[PDB]
Amino acid sequence: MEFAFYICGLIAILATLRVITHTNPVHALLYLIISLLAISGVFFSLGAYFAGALEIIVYAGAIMVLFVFVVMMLNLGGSEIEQERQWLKPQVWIGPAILSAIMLVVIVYAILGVNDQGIDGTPISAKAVGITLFGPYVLAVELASMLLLAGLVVAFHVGREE
Amino acid sequence: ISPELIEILLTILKAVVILLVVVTCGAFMSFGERRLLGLFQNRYGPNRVGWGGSLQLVADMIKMFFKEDWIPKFSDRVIFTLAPMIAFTSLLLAFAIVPVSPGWVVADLNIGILFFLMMAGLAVYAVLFAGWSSNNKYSLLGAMRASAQTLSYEVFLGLSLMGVVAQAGSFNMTDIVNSQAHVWNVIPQFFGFITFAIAGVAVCHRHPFDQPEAEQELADGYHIEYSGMKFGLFFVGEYIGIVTISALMVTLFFGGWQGPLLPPFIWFALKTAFFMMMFILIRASLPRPRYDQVMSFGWKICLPLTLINLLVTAAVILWQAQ
Amino acid sequence: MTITPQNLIALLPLLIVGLTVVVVMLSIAWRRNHFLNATLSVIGLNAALVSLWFVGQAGAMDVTPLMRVDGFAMLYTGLVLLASLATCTFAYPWLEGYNDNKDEFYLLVLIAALGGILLANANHLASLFLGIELISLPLFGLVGYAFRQKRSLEASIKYTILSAAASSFLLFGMALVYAQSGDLSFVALGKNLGDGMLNEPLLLAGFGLMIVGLGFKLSLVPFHLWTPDVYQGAPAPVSTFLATASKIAIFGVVMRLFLYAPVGDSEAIRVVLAIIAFASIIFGNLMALSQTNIKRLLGYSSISHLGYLLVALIALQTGEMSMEAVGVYLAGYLFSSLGAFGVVSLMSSPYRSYRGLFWHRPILAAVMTVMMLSLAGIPMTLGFIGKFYVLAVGVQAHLWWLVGAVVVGSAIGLYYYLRVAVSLYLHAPPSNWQYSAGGIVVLISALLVLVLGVWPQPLISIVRLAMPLM
Amino acid sequence: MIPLQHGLILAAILFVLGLTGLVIRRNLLFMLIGLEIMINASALAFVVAGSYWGQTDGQVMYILAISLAAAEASIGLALLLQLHRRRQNLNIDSVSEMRG
Amino acid sequence: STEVIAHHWAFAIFLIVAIGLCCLMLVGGWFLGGRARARSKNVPFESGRLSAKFYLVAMFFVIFDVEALYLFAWSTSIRESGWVGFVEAAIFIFVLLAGLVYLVRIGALDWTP
Amino acid sequence: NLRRIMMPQTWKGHPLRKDYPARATEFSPFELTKAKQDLEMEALTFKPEEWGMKRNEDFMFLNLGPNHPSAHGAFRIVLQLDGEEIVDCVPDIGYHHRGAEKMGERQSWHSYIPYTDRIEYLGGCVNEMPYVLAVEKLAGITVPDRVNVIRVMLSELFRINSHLLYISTFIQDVGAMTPVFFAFTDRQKIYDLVEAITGFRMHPAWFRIGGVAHDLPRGWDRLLREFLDWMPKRLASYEKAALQNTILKGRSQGVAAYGAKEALEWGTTGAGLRATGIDFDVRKARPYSGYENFD
Numbered sequence A: 001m002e003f004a005f006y007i008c009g010l011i012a013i014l015a016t017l018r019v020i021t022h023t024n025p026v027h028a029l030l031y032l033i034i035s036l037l038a039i040s041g042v043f044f045s046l047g048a049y050f051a052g053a054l055e056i057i058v059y060a061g062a063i064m065v066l067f068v069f070v071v072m073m074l075n076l077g078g079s080e081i082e083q084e085r086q087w088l089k090p091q092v093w094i095g096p097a098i099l100s101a102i103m104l105v106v107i108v109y110a111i112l113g114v115n116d117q118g119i120d121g122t123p124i125s126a127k128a129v130g131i132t133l134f135g136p137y138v139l140a141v142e143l144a145s146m147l148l149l150a151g152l153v154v155a156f157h158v159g160r161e162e
Numbered sequence B: 001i002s003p004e005l006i007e008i009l010l011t012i013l014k015a016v017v018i019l020l021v022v023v024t025c026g027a028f029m030s031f032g033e034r035r036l037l038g039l040f041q042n043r044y045g046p047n048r049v050g051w052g053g054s055l056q057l058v059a060d061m062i063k064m065f066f067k068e069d070w071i072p073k074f075s076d077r078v079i080f081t082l083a084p085m086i087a088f089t090s091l092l093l094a095f096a097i098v099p100v101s102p103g104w105v106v107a108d109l110n111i112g113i114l115f116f117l118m119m120a121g122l123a124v125y126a127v128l129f130a131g132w133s134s135n136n137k138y139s140l141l142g143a144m145r146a147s148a149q150t151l152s153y154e155v156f157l158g159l160s161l162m163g164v165v166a167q168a169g170s171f172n173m174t175d176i177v178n179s180q181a182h183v184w185n186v187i188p189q190f191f192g193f194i195t196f197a198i199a200g201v202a203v204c205h206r207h208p209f210d211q212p213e214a215e216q217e218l219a220d221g222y223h224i225e226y227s228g229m230k231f232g233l234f235f236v237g238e239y240i241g242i243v244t245i246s247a248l249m250v251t252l253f254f255g256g257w258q259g260p261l262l263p264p265f266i267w268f269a270l271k272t273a274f275f276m277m278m279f280i281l282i283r284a285s286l287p288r289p290r291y292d293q294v295m296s297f298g299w300k301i302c303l304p305l306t307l308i309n310l311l312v313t314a315a316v317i318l319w320q321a322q
Numbered sequence C: 001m002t003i004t005p006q007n008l009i010a011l012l013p014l015l016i017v018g019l020t021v022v023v024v025m026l027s028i029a030w031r032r033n034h035f036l037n038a039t040l041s042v043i044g045l046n047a048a049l050v051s052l053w054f055v056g057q058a059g060a061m062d063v064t065p066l067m068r069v070d071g072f073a074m075l076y077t078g079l080v081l082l083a084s085l086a087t088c089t090f091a092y093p094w095l096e097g098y099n100d101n102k103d104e105f106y107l108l109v110l111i112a113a114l115g116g117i118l119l120a121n122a123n124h125l126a127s128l129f130l131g132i133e134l135i136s137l138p139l140f141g142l143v144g145y146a147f148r149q150k151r152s153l154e155a156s157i158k159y160t161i162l163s164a165a166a167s168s169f170l171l172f173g174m175a176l177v178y179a180q181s182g183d184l185s186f187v188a189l190g191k192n193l194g195d196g197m198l199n200e201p202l203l204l205a206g207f208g209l210m211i212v213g214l215g216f217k218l219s220l221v222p223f224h225l226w227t228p229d230v231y232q233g234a235p236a237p238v239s240t241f242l243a244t245a246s247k248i249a250i251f252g253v254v255m256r257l258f259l260y261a262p263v264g265d266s267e268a269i270r271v272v273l274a275i276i277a278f279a280s281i282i283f284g285n286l287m288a289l290s291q292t293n294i295k296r297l298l299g300y301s302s303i304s305h306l307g308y309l310l311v312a313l314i315a316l317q318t319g320e321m322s323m324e325a326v327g328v329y330l331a332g333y334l335f336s337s338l339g340a341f342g343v344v345s346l347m348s349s350p351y352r353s354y355r356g357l358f359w360h361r362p363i364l365a366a367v368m369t370v371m372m373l374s375l376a377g378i379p380m381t382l383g384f385i386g387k388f389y390v391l392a393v394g395v396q397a398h399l400w401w402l403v404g405a406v407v408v409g410s411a412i413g414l415y416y417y418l419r420v421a422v423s424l425y426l427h428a429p430p431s432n433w434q435y436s437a438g439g440i441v442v443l444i445s446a447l448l449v450l451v452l453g454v455w456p457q458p459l460i461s462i463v464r465l466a467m468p469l470m
Numbered sequence D: 001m002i003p004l005q006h007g008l009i010l011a012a013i014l015f016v017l018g019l020t021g022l023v024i025r026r027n028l029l030f031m032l033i034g035l036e037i038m039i040n041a042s043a044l045a046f047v048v049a050g051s052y053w054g055q056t057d058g059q060v061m062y063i064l065a066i067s068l069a070a071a072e073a074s075i076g077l078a079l080l081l082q083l084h085r086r087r088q089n090l091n092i093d094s095v096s097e098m099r100g
Numbered sequence E: 001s002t003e004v005i006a007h008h009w010a011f012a013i014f015l016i017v018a019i020g021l022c023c024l025m026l027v028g029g030w031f032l033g034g035r036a037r038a039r040s041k042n043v044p045f046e047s048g049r050l051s052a053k054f055y056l057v058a059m060f061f062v063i064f065d066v067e068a069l070y071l072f073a074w075s076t077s078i079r080e081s082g083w084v085g086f087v088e089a090a091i092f093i094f095v096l097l098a099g100l101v102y103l104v105r106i107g108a109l110d111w112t113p
Numbered sequence F: 001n002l003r004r005i006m007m008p009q010t011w012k013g014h015p016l017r018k019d020y021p022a023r024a025t026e027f028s029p030f031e032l033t034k035a036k037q038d039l040e041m042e043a044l045t046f047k048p049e050e051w052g053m054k055r056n057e058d059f060m061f062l063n064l065g066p067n068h069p070s071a072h073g074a075f076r077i078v079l080q081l082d083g084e085e086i087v088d089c090v091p092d093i094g095y096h097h098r099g100a101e102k103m104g105e106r107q108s109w110h111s112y113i114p115y116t117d118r119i120e121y122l123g124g125c126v127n128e129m130p131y132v133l134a135v136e137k138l139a140g141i142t143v144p145d146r147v148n149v150i151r152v153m154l155s156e157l158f159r160i161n162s163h164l165l166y167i168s169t170f171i172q173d174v175g176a177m178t179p180v181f182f183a184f185t186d187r188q189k190i191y192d193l194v195e196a197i198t199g200f201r202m203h204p205a206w207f208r209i210g211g212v213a214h215d216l217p218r219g220w221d222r223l224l225r226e227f228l229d230w231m232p233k234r235l236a237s238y239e240k241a242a243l244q245n246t247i248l249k250g251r252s253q254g255v256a257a258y259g260a261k262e263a264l265e266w267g268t269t270g271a272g273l274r275a276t277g278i279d280f281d282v283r284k285a286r287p288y289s290g291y292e293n294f295d
């Protein structure tokens, strides 16, 4: 339980670090596929079976398939991306990096001063999530379907060839 | 020496035996593809390499091992090497949750068929990566067409599964195969039967949905740049996927290993092999539809059919439970 | 918790707008008719408006672990529904010149109004999150409705990226406050603490991330820079809709969150929000000194008046009439922003110079200048009653710095508002009933502003009637 | 026996890495990637917060988070497709005409 | 228990042996066999911008697959949720089918010109 | 555009002029150096302005061929694609130019018949028939009726062979792969009869000026009877298995349709013209070789 969680977290952080510091869109997309697999391994270590299963079903199975589809649309062969590599110049990235660094310091200082007795890792089955989803969270289900409908119709209206 | 370690080693040995049997019957299903097309086309097929052609598959394995393995210089190396790996391992791991016999299962997961669904997602990743990595606009458009096809059928694959999920009441394979102890699931989930059959055929790159044989004349197949053992990896992955979808179908809709008189593994093998022969019949018989027709049948027909099937299944289940 | 028939009549507006979305969608799918879809849009919004009267007959009820309906909810739901009705009425003559598909606009308006109703009724972290996102999604739908235009497309990209970032900020704070507290109900935030350790660091940090998200959502400093770009790039009915309904709905849910939470009276949160109010008023008044365009000017005005609103917010735990002041000032805000952006919309319609407007459109110039005065806090207008209420609220709780901020910002607002007002009457070198309907809407907005600036007692009584669950 | 704090920190490095991915990148595709990093980080934080208390509320809000992820990813990618179709570039600093 | 950890180790053994078998077969394919050189060997097989309907189909799949995951969560607890959950899933299905009918009737799913 | 249609643009002279050397032995042996291969591959590269494509910045350009994994020769099509719609295309032919007319200026009257055999390699005696008919018109030769019936029989046999191959290849192009095996077995039966009568399978070269090469062997009626009772049940099975399939109908019905005007102005004959309702067949309009003695 501990080994899988820590290994998946380590390769997760390494993977997303390789995503944000890469120039090839397909290579970064593959790296974040690996990262999402790692987040789902973290979820399975924590006992959230439905959450990690769903991360590989749609988060690592549907949305980024559309991402690769758009990369296939554009055929990004490195035009106006790698010819300057301006995001690797230290005068560009050092400032925002120290911004996110002091933000991370503040966030982990807030996290480290809270109670904790550990996570027992008892599995939460998909039937309990289904019971709660169509129990006290029914408005969330229907209005999230409405949200998906709104995203669908706007993406249709904008993404047209004509 | 300890009985717990003995049981662990026996379970590991059973899993390894199952995996080796699956890959060997995938290669033997390549050989059975050739032989059964020969039988169905009023011929014999390969029958001179060994007795009855049984040593032909060794010759293809030797040839594709000792053929030159070549990665194009203009192609990206890592994605080119990676795509057949995914196309093999995704459907292999999709097999990995099938209960063949009582006491003979690799992983009695609480999810199962969900893990099959995410391996199908990995399969669409495999075809997308194989298409993009070749650096060829013919393979680019061909694999885009194939990937859109398999998306348009993987959208309702899970919803066709959901009828059997509703009847079983859980996600585990053992509960699914034990809910068919009285009546086989092919009878109530007949719409689930046809929709899952169509989705499994389309998602596994099989006729009449196989893109590299859909348009050979445009020279736009995404396998066109793949040669050597990568090509054999692609076909072994496709045939292993045929075996995987057949075993999934047997354990889902046809009662799995349950049988009146024969041992359960014999019944499982017979039902799987019957569905493999059904694959041969639909490959050799069914003509290939046009691409927009495939889009229309995937979206405007099959998905509402799965939704209505799930609604009717829920109404019947709650109505019967007073 | 199960849903009773009394609970079904409590969900009357959300159900009505959902059914209207379905009906409008099926009418679009049958035949693409612009006028029929607009007619079903306004008919459904009016049906929801009458459903608020039925809910007011029904009464107040906690309906879900999520949702809660009280007079607060009916009042803000009515404000949002009036805003969306005005948006449709102004959007039809603008859409009369659009060559592309016209019928998706009303569908997006009803979806965002449904999200605004969700946010008005929200009594949960899940309800707040889903209502915010239901507001946000068709807002990028309508801002970039004319993607052929340069300005609309860049404003759409800006709002999309910035709102997605603020959404993740709010949701991360949501996860942190759930990790600290243990329940997502509004009343249990900080209820697990007492005896002086209410200021838990993880609770405060998660709450501050939600404050960052909502401060983006109400155009608060320093998340205020998106306002003029998105306001100018978007079409004028979209500018009206975003200026009124989104701000009203998210400010109502911020009222409810800071009223119900036991940690809402924290000292550090009070100081942080006081700093945000001070900076927002001062900045959003100082930006609009030298603006030649109406839309960016109204965006900075929106930043300044949202600073005034949060000034009224900061004394909700000490004073008692803070909710009444917020309701009155939001009524004045609603009528003012429909007035200004409606005159802008009828000037910019159909799709294809405020100086010297009086010599071609005299009544439009008249409604524009009275509403320009109404935004300033000039007497005989409802905006003056709004500043009077917020200044009384700030006085009774010894918020002297924020009072001086309101005074200075109102002086700067007087400068640029009456600058535009005198620019209207200088000298410079239609024929359909829907344009007349939009003009009628802006004229009743002007008459409501004038009458409620003369006799503000009925509005005060109406807002005092709508009390929340104590 | 896994501490809740460790999962919270892990989600924090993922969130701030998504923050850098939004800020320092001029390709809008990589910016949408970074937005996905933040949203996935928030979903992971909410999952581990739910699993600490042993409740399904974290999983439900995770599902809501990924529904939002799908909607807004489609939204941003439609906007990217239209921008690349009509502008022939993906540099966002070029998309800065409005100013004031 | 012993049985569950035995099944977990069997699954891990399946994972690593499948990975090693595929990688070993690719290694054997790449290692063996002599190599050739030619001029047109490294040129591609051409025998000597495309439309965004692919994106529209994929994004359609994304949205309908998220609604499908909602149905996936519902399907495992149909009996315990009672008739009320069935009714709520019925408005869910009605909204989904109304959206699909809308997409069909506007040519969004109609690929042909 | 008056460009070369059969030969590459990098060609000198005009072959059908009387002073041109017909034989490749008169020319130098075909050297294919590195530079020659480079310029020959450069000549086959298609650039839109010369061929009249006149390229919006969205039209995808597609190349099919010149290699052609099908039975009907090898050729190239250049395609302009508005998304997935073919907006303009021009065929590229001349990849199978055998120089048959200049060859006919080289061989004698008798020796030319094997060259008329391979004009269309699915006709055989059907291709031999008009050449020997025109030669007999030149020589004033009136063939006997038995010669006419033998030539009619061989022409009909090769017509059935060609139609079987066409149906098999079309069905395989749709996607059904078994009728190609069955129809090629039927072609083997036809080839058995043709081998027995003439002595070769695809190209018999059996017609002669004024008659046929040999007399019929004893027993041809047995093989003809065997094929005649073998055929119709196989044709009915062909129809019921693939031609009445609804997927094949959806693939084929309404695809590339034209009326009588478009067929007439573009010179289309055969079933392409007869599908427009224009009843024009040579065997009935202008009867030749005693085709009027058949019902």
Ligand SMILES: CCCCCCCCCCCCCCCCCC(=O)OC[C@H](COP(=O)(O)OCCN)OC(=O)CCCCCCCCCCCCCCCCC
Residues within 6 Å of the ligand: B194, B196, B197, B198, B200, B201, B208, B245, B246, B249, B275, B278, B279, B282, B286, B289, B290, B293, B294, B296, B297, F246, F247, F249, F250, F251, F252, F253, F254
């Ligand atoms: C382990 C699981 C699998 C085991 C193997 C057994 C199952 C194999 C399943 C194979 C699935 C193949 C699906 C092919 C679908 C093609 C749909 C399509 O696009 O059809 C187009 C065609 C014409 O469409 P239209 O729009 O009318 O065209 C007008 C243009 N002139 O429209 C038509 O032709 C209309 C009819 C379309 C197809 C109807 C459904 C056919 C289902 C497949 C055959 C099943 C036979 C029994 C299998 C064994 C059962 C025990």
Ligand SMILES: CCCCCCCCCCCCCCCCCCCC
Residues within 6 Å of the ligand: B017, B018, B021, B022, B025, B100, B101, B104, B243, B263, B264, B265, B266, B269, B272
């Ligand atoms: C296509 C079929 C693939 C099957 C893969 C797994 C094979 C496992 C074989 C197990 C054999 C023993 C089964 C348990 C005992 C019952 C049967 C006894 C007689 C064989």
